[PDB]
Swiss-Prot record, chain A:
Part of the 30S ribosomal subunit. Contacts proteins S8 and S17. Interacts with ArfA. May interact with IF1 in the 30S initiation complex. The lineage of its organism: Bacteria, Pseudomonadati, Pseudomonadota, Gammaproteobacteria, Enterobacterales. The gene is rpsL. GO terms for cellular component: cytoplasm; cytosol; cytosolic small ribosomal subunit; ribosome. This is Small ribosomal subunit protein uS12. It comes from Escherichia coli (strain K12). PANTHER family: 30S RIBOSOMAL PROTEIN S12 FAMILY MEMBER. InterPro entries: NA-bd_OB-fold (IPR012340), Ribosomal_uS12 (IPR006032), Ribosomal_uS12_bac (IPR005679). GO terms for molecular function: misfolded RNA binding; rRNA binding; structural constituent of ribosome; tRNA binding.
Curated annotation (Swiss-Prot), chain B:
Belongs to the class I-like SAM-binding methyltransferase superfamily. rRNA adenine N(6)-methyltransferase family. RsmA subfamily. It comes from the Bacteria. This is Ribosomal RNA small subunit methyltransferase A. One of its GO terms (molecular function) is RNA binding. Its EC number is 2.1.1.182. It comes from Escherichia coli O7:K1 (strain IAI39 / ExPEC). S-adenosyl-L-methionine binds at N2, L4, G29, E50, D75, N97. Keywords: Cytoplasm, Methyltransferase, RNA-binding, rRNA processing, S-adenosyl-L-methionine, Transferase. One of its GO terms (cellular component) is cytosol.
Length: 123, 252, 151
RNA sequence: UAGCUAGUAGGUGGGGUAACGGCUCACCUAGGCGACGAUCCCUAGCUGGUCUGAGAGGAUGACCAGCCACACUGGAACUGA
RNA sequence: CCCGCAGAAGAAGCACCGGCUAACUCCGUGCCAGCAGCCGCGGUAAUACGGAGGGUGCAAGCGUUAAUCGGAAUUACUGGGCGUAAAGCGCACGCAGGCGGUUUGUUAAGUCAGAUGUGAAAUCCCCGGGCUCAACCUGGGAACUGCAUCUGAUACUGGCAAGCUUGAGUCUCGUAGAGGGGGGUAGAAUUCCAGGUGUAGCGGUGAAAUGCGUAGAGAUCUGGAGGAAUACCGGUGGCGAAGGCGGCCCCCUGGACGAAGACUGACGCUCAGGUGCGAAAGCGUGGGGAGCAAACAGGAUUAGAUACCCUGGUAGUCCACGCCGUAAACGAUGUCGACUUGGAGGUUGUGCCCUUGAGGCGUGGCUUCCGGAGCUAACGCGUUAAGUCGACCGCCUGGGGAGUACGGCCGCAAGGUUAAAACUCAAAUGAAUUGACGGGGGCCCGCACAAGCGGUGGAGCAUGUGGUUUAAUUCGAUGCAACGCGA
RNA sequence: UCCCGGGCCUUGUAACCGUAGGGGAACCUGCGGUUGGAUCACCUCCU
């Protein structure tokens, strides 16, 4: 509408949140697994999802996804988390990091292994 | 018409009822076997009314249930619960689920037996339950909730989503329990005076009570009772309503 | 909240005890999904992997004979750093320890609580609620949690 | 977040500073400010710049250079250019 | 930094390979679970899972996360929208604010031109130089959009002065109209009362019942009461800002349009706050209460029926005086002004011609329906724009959460009003296309029916099928469209 | 006309708004305004 309205009130460009706010723009954060559990997604859905309630150093507690194979991971253990969305799951916007401070690499895996926290085979 | 479908909330209701011997328990509207079985199970023996004689045959012929209950086949609004309270040795626990047009009648018939009933435990639709427990100063308040809260203390038990029912309605519904007062906290000279005071008032709920109860009492009576006649009918607690009822009855 | 809680417990007990793990808690919630939550512990330990195992087992062995399957999904869990707990014996392991409780009784001197377990009765939890002490029946409670001190 | 303000706004006179000035003090006037957003509350050191953007813009002020403020916290004041 | 010496000698990884997106096949795998930015991948091969070979990309790095800008015109200064997708205040008046016809002089604030001072250096950019190159460093220029001051310029804008009549507005004469306010009054009508005649029914529904009547109802005649509303005209019709306005007469009163001049002399438009008007419902105070009728009450119906039916019936509906302040208060379309093909009507003035009376040439106003151009997502809109444009105002920025919270304000109370966010979702939405629609609805067709003939269905027996039985009664076909059928 | 299929053109097939009140329901009722008077949608592909 009128330029006179625009000088009476300028263009209100909107703000948006961090969609992964419990990082406070840290590239990663540390926490402890306040509980750990595994879920079927649905009545016919067989693909178990592995998930943790984890409290961060900043006192937030949040859900995070456990990617790939099993671990030692059990409630007194400590975890590094980073941004990442499990698209099918509700609100799961944090991935745990493979090969982090209390976290094993996927020993078996021969492909993409720098994602999975695992060193070059020793050949 | 409806009856429940899902074991989680069936089990929640029958467990929240806490149905055991040492209680004069009677079902009304046993309906589908799934929700009458756990209560007929936990009570060593149980009384029941079904309104339908065909369902009463289905359940009386069921060997889980016919050997484990005593069964009656009639409109419960005919039924002499005051004699059943004598036959059951102590005032009754009356409970269940129904098509509930009859609900409004159920409450009055239960209240005709406030002596003979120890407590009532029933499912009902969300709006009528929230009305039944409504605080005096709310739009949910009104004459039937007044009479209910007069007769009994009233207590929501738990609330149930519509997909929980066998024919699932659109309408969320809750089980509620209520307790005829061991002595009436509001002593009244008569209940017909309450019933007519409340209907006159709520038939006129938008205007001042000077233009509702002041069509019968004077403003100097009302202010003499300590009541501001400039209030609306939905500002008024059951306490001053029973005070008005006593005033009507004793000054007549 | 559960279906047929004893039947469910035994059907779950079969893979739990085949794995040599132990049950702790069974609870179901009704909502956007309707879903079943199993607390398992084993004092050598429960990993995510142990949950994964017993969960894939129950995801078969319950499903094939489900008494109900409405909106269904489930999870199996370690009982948290603040732990849900359910029986006289549980609170008895934890006499002297801080707790929170929510109850089937719902009345003033509020039956929603923070407590330190004072002692256990065969029918009741006795507890230092609000720095006072009082006692609540295992039947008049409905959910409780332990060491809420840990966030 | 709508009204704000009594050394408040202005004046005279005394005192005061290296210097002008409610700077301050006596009196005297009743002003002065604000919806062209005062008052109030939150948040922030500022700037040359930096990043992005075709540009207009948007973001931002680490490093380096200029300015500002602070020096255990809160108060003062000595000395000296 | 140069020089000597020996030897390929001491020195390559990391992503990804379904599409977007360069790069693919074998293998397993079983939806085991893995895979994931998104779209999505998978059971029997999976180019998407895991492994292998093969490939692509980038490289002493390569990937992941976070964060800002981009893309995003996705706040739209440049560079967006508001009939239906989100969006035009229910309406109007009006203060502040913005905007403003036309002619001449004047001014020179804006504006323009030029100058002068300043705009730290570094950075940026250009042109060079120097490190073996590069990064890096560095000379010189350019740049520093600006600010101040001086000087001119005078179109335009602003100021000032003077006018001007086209906008605005006054006057004179008419015209049409449910415009408003106030006061009388009429004929129907219902109910009610009072009789009169009269008598077994009435009333109601699908049928019933409740209801009314032998104290005479119902019916019908007369007489009276009271409250409410204006049959018909009446219209694709008028008036009104909108809400709205309809028997008739009077009284007061608002606006509008045409006629023909005359007059003022830009007096204008828009309008945040502000002010006022504002259906229906409801409230306030005091009347009234015929008919109707939430609530209520009672009879019925129904599996139930709270509905739908009926007999009742209060508030309310009416009036005066307060309030509320909302409506799909919607042309879902802000106000004002200019322009831009046509066509058929309606209504209401007016001029000229009328041969009169009809006519026929014109010519305003209002208004309805078509439709060109253009516009529009499309639907459609279309000189009464949703076309072409000028001034100002209002409003929107994904869907839910939510016009909801909270606070403020306002209200007698209802509530109104202003108005979040967390949280949650990959949509939500508008128009339009093709099937379902389907319940059909019609066009109709044939030994389909009808009109005939001869059967079948009862008897015996041939034959198939079934059931049953058996050591086996082999197996297949089982309504048409299996059953003397494969055979 | 009907009775059986077909072939064929194609429809006998209320929502809301504001507001006030009931309240087994979504709902029922009163007042007056608006018309925006209804459907629903599965097995692959390159020049
Ligand atoms: Mg002085
Ligand atoms: Mg751009
Ligand atoms: Mg390709
Ligand atoms: Mg847009
Ligand atoms: Mg819209
Ligand atoms: Mg409008
Ligand atoms: Mg001008
Ligand atoms: Mg001029
Ligand atoms: Mg009134
Ligand atoms: Mg009214
Ligand atoms: Mg509100
Ligand atoms: Mg025969
Ligand atoms: Mg065969
Ligand atoms: Mg076959
Ligand atoms: Mg044959
Ligand atoms: Mg209207």
């Amino acid at each position: 509408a009128t330029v006179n309205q625009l000088v009476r009130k300028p263009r209100a460009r909107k703000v948006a949140k961090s969609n992964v706010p419990a990082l406070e723009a840290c590239p990663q954060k540390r926490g402890v697994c306040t509980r750990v559990y595994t879920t079927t997604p649905k009545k016919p859905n067989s693909a178990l999802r592995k998930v943790c309630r984890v409290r961060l150093t900043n006192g937030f507690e949040v859900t995070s996804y456990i990617g790939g194979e099993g671990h030692n991971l059990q409630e007194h253990s400590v975890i590094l988390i980073r941004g990442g969305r499990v698209k099918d799951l509700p609100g799961v916007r944090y991935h745990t990091v493979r090969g982090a401070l209390d976290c094993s690499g996927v020993k078996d895996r021969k492909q993409a292994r720098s994602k999975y926290g695992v060193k070059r085979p020793k050949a | 018409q409806n009856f429940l479908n899902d074991q989680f909330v069936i089990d929640s209701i029958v467990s929240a009822i806490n149905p055991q011997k040492g209680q004069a328990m009677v079902e009304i509207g046993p309906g589908l076997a799934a929700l009458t079985e756990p209560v007929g199970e936990r009570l060593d023996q149980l009384t029941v009314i079904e309104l339908d004689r065909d369902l009463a045959a289905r359940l009386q012929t069921h060997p889980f249930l016919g050997p484990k209950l005593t069964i009656y086949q009639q409109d419960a609004m005919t039924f002499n619960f005051g004699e059943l309270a004598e036959k059951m040795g102590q005032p009754l626990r009356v409970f269940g689920n129904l098509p509930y047009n009859i609900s409004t009648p159920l409450m009055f018939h239960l209240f005709s037996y406030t002596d003979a009933i120890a407590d009532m435990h029933f499912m009902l639709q969300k709006e009528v339950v929230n009305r039944l427990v409504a605080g005096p100063n709310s739009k949910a308040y009104g004459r039937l909730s007044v009479m209910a809260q007069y007769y009994c203390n009233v207590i929501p038990v738990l609330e149930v989503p519509p997909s929980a029912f066998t024919p699932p309605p659109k309408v969320d519904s809750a089980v509620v329990r209520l307790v005829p007062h061991a002595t009436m906290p509001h002593p009244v000279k008569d209940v017909r005076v309450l019933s007519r005071i409340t209907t006159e008032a709520f038939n006129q709920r938008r205007k001042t009570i000077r233009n509702s109860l002041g069509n019968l009492f004077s403003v100097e009576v009302l202010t003499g009772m300590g009541i501001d006649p400039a209030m609306r009918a939905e500002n008024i607690s059951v306490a001053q309503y029973c005070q008005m009822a006593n005033y009507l009855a004793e000054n007549a | 909240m559960s279906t047929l809680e004893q039947k469910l417990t035994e059907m779950i007990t079969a893979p739990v005890e085949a794995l040599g793990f132990e049950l702790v808690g069974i609870e179901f919630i009704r909502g956007r999904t309707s879903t079943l939550r199993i607390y398992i512990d084993s004092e050598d330990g429960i990993n995510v992997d142990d949950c994964a195992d017993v969960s894939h087992q129950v995801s078969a062995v319950l499903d094939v004979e489900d008494p109900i399957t409405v909106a269904y999904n489930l999870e199996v869990s370690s009982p948290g750093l603040d732990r849900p707990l359910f029986t006289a014996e549980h609170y008895a392991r934890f006499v002297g320890e801080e707790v929170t409780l929510v109850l089937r009784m719902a009345v003033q001197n509020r039956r929603k609580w923070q407590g330190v377990i004072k002692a256990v009765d065969g029918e009741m939890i006795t507890v230092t609620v609000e720095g006072k002490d009082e006692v609540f029946a295992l039947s008049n409670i409905q959910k409780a949690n332990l060491v809420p001190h840990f966030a």
